[PDB]
Amino acid sequence: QWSGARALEALLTVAGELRGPPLQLDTGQLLKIAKRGGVTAVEAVHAWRNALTGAPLNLTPEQVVAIASHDGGKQALETVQRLLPVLCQAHGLTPQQVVAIASHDGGKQALETVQRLLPVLCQAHGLTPEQVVAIASHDGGKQALETVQALLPVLCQAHGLTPEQVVAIASNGGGKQALETVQRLLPVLCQAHGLTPQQVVAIASNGGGKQALETVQRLLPVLCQAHGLTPQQVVAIASNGGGKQALETVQRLLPVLCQAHGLTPQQVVAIASNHGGKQALETVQRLLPVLCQAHGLTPQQVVAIASNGGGKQALETVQRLLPVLCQAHGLTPQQVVAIASHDGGKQALETVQRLLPVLCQAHGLTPEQVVAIASNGGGKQALETVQRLLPVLCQAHGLTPEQVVAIASHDGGKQALETVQRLLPVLCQAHGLTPQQVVAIASNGGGRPALESIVAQLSRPDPALAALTNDHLVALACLGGRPALDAVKKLE
DNA sequence: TGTCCCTTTATCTCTCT
DNA sequence: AGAGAGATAAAGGGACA
3-state secondary structure A124-190: CCCCCHHHHHHHHCCCCHHHHHHHHHHHHHHHHHCCCCCHHHHHHHHCCCCHHHHHHHHHHHHHHHH
Find and list the nucleotides of strand B having atoms within 7 Å of a protein beta carbon.
Answer: 1-17
CA-based max dimension of chain A? 77
Residue nearest to nucleotide C10 (CA to C1'): A36
Gap between the Cα atoms of A481 and A419, Å rounded: 14
Strand B–CB A140 distance below 7 A? yes
Residue nearest to nucleotide B4 (CA to C1'): A106
**Own/partner long-range contacts of A49-55 (Cβ < 8 Å, ≥24 apart):** A49/A18, A49/A22, A49/A23, A50/A22, A51/A81, A52/A77, A52/A80, A52/A81, A53/A22, A53/A23, A54/A22
The whole-angstrom separation of Cα A96 and Cα A59 is 9
**Interatomic separation, CA of residue A485 and C1' of nucleotide B15, rounded (Å):** 13
User: How far lies A249's CA from each of A223, A270, A287, A289, in Å?
Assistant: 11, 13, 16, 19
Distance A1 CA to C4 C1' (A): 55
The closest alpha carbon to A198, from A148, A241, A234, A162, belongs to A162
3 state SS of A239: coil
Q: What is the resolution of this structure in A?
A: 2.5
Helical (H) or strand (E) element with A6: helix A4-18
CA of A40 to C1' of B2 (A): 8
How crowded is residue A344: how many other Cβ atoms within 10 Å of its Cβ? 20
Handedness of CA A273, A279, A282, A286 (dihedral sign): negative
Q: Can you tell me which residue has its alpha carbon closest to the C1' of nucleotide B6?
A: A174
Omega into A398 within 30° of 0, i.e. cis? Answer: no
Q: Identify whether the C-beta of residue A98 lies closer than 8 Å to the C-beta of residue A92.
A: no
How far apart are alpha carbons A377 and A348 in whole angstroms?
8
Contact present, A272 and A237 (Cβ < 8 Å): yes
Give yes or no for a cis peptide into A92 (omega within 30° of 0).
Answer: no
* Residue A289: HSE in the Cβ half-sphere, 13 Å Cα cutoff: 7
Distance of C1' in C17 from CA in A284, Å: 45
The reply to whether A91 has its C-beta less than 7 Å from any atom of strand B is no
Instruction: Indicate the DSSP class of residue A192.
Output: I
- Nearest nucleotide to the CA of A245, by C1', is B8
3-state SS, A345-410, equals: HHHHHHHHHHHHHHHHHCCCCCHHHHHHHHCCCCHHHHHHHHHHHHHHHHHHHCCCHHHHHHHHCC
Q: What is the length of chain A?
A: 492
Gaps in chain A (C–N > 2.5 Å) come after which residues? none
Instruction: Measure the CA–CA gap between A263 and A276, rounded to whole angstroms.
Output: 19
- Residues near A462 by beta carbon (within 8 Å), at least 6 away in sequence: A489, A492
Closest nucleotide to the alpha carbon of A275, via C1': B9
Calculate the angstrom distance between C1' of C16 and CA of A46.
28
Task: Report CA torsion sign: A257, A263, A268, A270.
Answer: negative
Residue of A112, A89, A87, A106 whose CA lies nearest to A97: A87
A472's enclosing H/E stretch is: helix A470-489
CB of A74 within 7 Å of some strand B atom? yes
> What is the dihedral angle through the alpha carbons of A309, A311, A317, A320, rounded to the nearest 10 degrees?
170
Task: Write the Ramachandran bin of A219: left for phi over 0, alpha for psi from -120 to 50, otherwise beta.
Answer: alpha
Name the residues contacting strand C (CB < 7 Å): A 32, 35-36, 66, 69, 71, 100, 103, 105, 134, 137-139, 168, 171, 173, 202, 205-207, 236, 239-241, 270, 273, 275, 309, 343, 377, 411, 444-445
